[PDB]
Scaffold this active site. Structure first.
Site, PDB file in Angstrom:
ATOM      1  N   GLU A  34      33.546  45.274  -7.680  1.00  0.00           N
ATOM      2  CA  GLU A  34      34.031  44.071  -8.350  1.00  0.00           C
ATOM      3  C   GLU A  34      33.751  44.136  -9.843  1.00  0.00           C
ATOM      4  O   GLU A  34      34.550  43.646 -10.650  1.00  0.00           O
ATOM      5  CB  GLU A  34      33.395  42.802  -7.776  1.00  0.00           C
ATOM      6  CG  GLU A  34      33.820  42.455  -6.377  1.00  0.00           C
ATOM      7  CD  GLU A  34      35.203  41.829  -6.326  1.00  0.00           C
ATOM      8  OE1 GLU A  34      35.798  41.596  -7.401  1.00  0.00           O
ATOM      9  OE2 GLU A  34      35.698  41.586  -5.205  1.00  0.00           O
ATOM     10  N   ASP A  51      37.030  34.702 -12.822  1.00  0.00           N
ATOM     11  CA  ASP A  51      36.010  35.265 -11.941  1.00  0.00           C
ATOM     12  C   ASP A  51      34.800  35.615 -12.798  1.00  0.00           C
ATOM     13  O   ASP A  51      34.942  36.240 -13.854  1.00  0.00           O
ATOM     14  CB  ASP A  51      36.523  36.512 -11.216  1.00  0.00           C
ATOM     15  CG  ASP A  51      37.712  36.224 -10.324  1.00  0.00           C
ATOM     16  OD1 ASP A  51      37.705  35.179  -9.645  1.00  0.00           O
ATOM     17  OD2 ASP A  51      38.651  37.045 -10.295  1.00  0.00           O
TER      18      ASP A  51
END
Length: 133
Positions: A34, A51
């Site tokens: 990620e 995010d």
């Protein structure tokens, strides 16, 4: 900002948070893919949402009083910190809620990195380079 090594991140979850081996291998993989274990990683998505942090958690549902919902009840900034406590806490809530709605053992499917890169890994093998005397 702090950027962890893979084994460093693994050792941290064990030493400081006493996570199970099962938990660690899953979180390490997700963190790697990620964010490259970059606590200040930030990605602005097409829907105008962002995010945040090592687990690239989205402010539409999970953080930020002012935008979308705030299930984790935290300023997103708290998820972008050298100290990963709140990132982990909020990730565990995401895992728990996903599992509830999605089914037993499916908690991590909320993460894109898990779905593309980790559900197909041998995560005992993946952790082998760290876990060896």
């Amino acid at each position: 900002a702090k950027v962890f090594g893979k084994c460093e991140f693994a050792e941290l979850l064990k030493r400081d948070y006493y996570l199970s081996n099962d938990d660690i291998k899953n979180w390490v993989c997700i963190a790697e893919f990620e964010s490259s274990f970059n606590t200040a990683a930030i990605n602005r998505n097409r829907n105008r949402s962002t995010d945040y942090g090592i687990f690239q958690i989205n402010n539409k549902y999970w953080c930020g009083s002012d935008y979308g919902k705030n299930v984790c009840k935290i300023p997103c900034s708290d998820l972008m910190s050298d100290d990963i406590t709140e990132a982990l806490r909020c990730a565990e809530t995401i895992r728990r809620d996903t599992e509830r709605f999605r089914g037993r053992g499916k908690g991590y499917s909320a993460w894109v990195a898990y779905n593309s890169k980790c559900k197909n890994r041998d995560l005992d093998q993946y952790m082998a380079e760290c876990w060896s005397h």
